[PDB]
Structures are given as structure tokens and as C-alpha cells.
Amino acid sequence: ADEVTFVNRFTVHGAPAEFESVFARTAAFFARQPGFVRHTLLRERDKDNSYVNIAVWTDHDAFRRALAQPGFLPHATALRALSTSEHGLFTARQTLPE
Amino acid sequence: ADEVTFVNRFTVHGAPAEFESVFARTAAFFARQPGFVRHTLLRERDKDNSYVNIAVWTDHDAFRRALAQPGFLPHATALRALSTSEHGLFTARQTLPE
Numbered sequence: 040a041d042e043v044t045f046v047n048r049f050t051v052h053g054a055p056a057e058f059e060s061v062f063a064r065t066a067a068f069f070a071r072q073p074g075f076v077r078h079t080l081l082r083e084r085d086k087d088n089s090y091v092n093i094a095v096w097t098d099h100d101a102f103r104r105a106l107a108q109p110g111f112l113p114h115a116t117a118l119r120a121l122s123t124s125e126h127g128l129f130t131a132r133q134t135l136p137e
Numbered sequence: 138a139d140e141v142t143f144v145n146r147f148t149v150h151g152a153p154a155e156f157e158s159v160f161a162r163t164a165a166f167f168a169r170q171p172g173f174v175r176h177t178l179l180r181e182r183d184k185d186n187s188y189v190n191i192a193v194w195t196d197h198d199a200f201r202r203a204l205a206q207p208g209f210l211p212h213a214t215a216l217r218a219l220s221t222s223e224h225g226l227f228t229a230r231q232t233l234p235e
């Protein structure tokens with residue numbers, strides 16, 4: 040119930056290999072934060088520059104705290120230098136297997 | 138690896154309760170298909186009409202075979218009566234924890 044899922048859709052403008060390298064360090068940063076549960080970076084099949092990240096947090100407060108960390112800035116900056124994003128925060132309604 | 142992840146973004150134009158009920162039946166239909174791994178239906182926080190579904194399949198062929206089932210067609214008809222959607226098929230690039 041409390042758990043939140045942040046979903047980002049990226050359009051990569053720069054080199055996808057550089058994007059992935061930057062994202063790996065971004066994810067490691069977030070993995071150091073209290074409340075981090077898991078993440079998966081997905082790449083669209085047959086597209087080169089289309090990515091979706093799914094990140095799970097114990098609660099909304101922990102997610103907001105992570106974004107507000109001073110340590111996030113270089114990662115946020117490096118990501119924005121390479122891509123644009125459309126994103127939203129979600130709660131789970133249904134899961135299978137149950 | 139071989140796993141594929143299908144991501145759907147729904148904009149619901151009917152009643153959300155009816156959408157969730159019809160979606161549950163469609164999800165059950167896919168859950169019976171060979172190669173189905175898991176799915177999660179997510180609802181955007183502070184919104185009534187925005188959902189994202191994430192579904193994992195063992196491989197691309199299993200996903201294709203499921204989509205091609207004649208039984209899918211009336212399910213699709215019912216779900217699309219209540220919602221529009223934008224979707225894509227993805228491969229996992231990074232996951233934490235490892």
C-alpha cells in the first residue's frame with residue numbers, strides 16, 4: 040500500500056552507451072538511499088534511444104528524500120545532458136502471480 | 138536475457154472501477170498463456186485516469202503467441218472501450234539488487 044513506483048520514459052539524445060554508463064552510477068547512488076527497493080532499466084526492442092526505468096521505493100517520503108539529496112545533482116545533470124524524460128509516481132493496484 | 142517486458146500506458150476514459158475489472162479479466166487471460174512470468178498494474182498517484190502495466194514474458198515468441206490467441210480479440214475490444222494506450226516491448230539492461 041505504502042510502496043511507490045517511479046516510472047521514467049527516456050528519449051536519449053546523446054550516445055546510448057554513455058547514457059547507460061551514466062544511468063548505472065545514478066542507480067548506484069539511489070541504491071545507497073534508505074527506502075530504495077529495486078530498479079530495472081529497460082531498452083525498447085528495435086529502438087536505440089528509447090528507455091524506461093522502473094524504480095520501487097518503500098514510501099513516497101523516501102522517494103522525495105532521495106531526489107532532494109545533494110549527491111543526486113551530478114547524476115541528474117549527466118542524465119539531462121544526454122536525454123529528456125517524462126515520468127510519474129504510481130501505486131500498485133494488481134499483481135500476478137498473486 | 139531472453140525475457141521481454143511489455144509496458145503499456147493507459148489513459149482511462151470510462152469508469153476506473155470498470156477499467157480495473159475488465160483489466161483483471163484480460164490479465165487473467167494472459168496469465169494462463171505459456172511463458173507468462175508476472176505483471177503489475179500501476180495507478181498514477183493523485184490521478185484517477187492514468188495507469189501503467191508492466192508484464193514480463195519468458196521470451197519474445199511466447200509474448201507473440203499469446204497476443205495472437207483468438208481469445209485476445211474480444212478482451213482487447215472490451216479494454217479499448219474504456220481506455221486508450223501507448224505501449225512498447227523492452228529488454229532489461231540493468232537491475233538492482235543483483
Ligand SMILES: [Cl-]
Binds near residue numbers: 116
Ligand atoms: Cl542545471
Ligand SMILES: [Cl-]
Binds near residue numbers: 206207209
Ligand atoms: Cl484463446
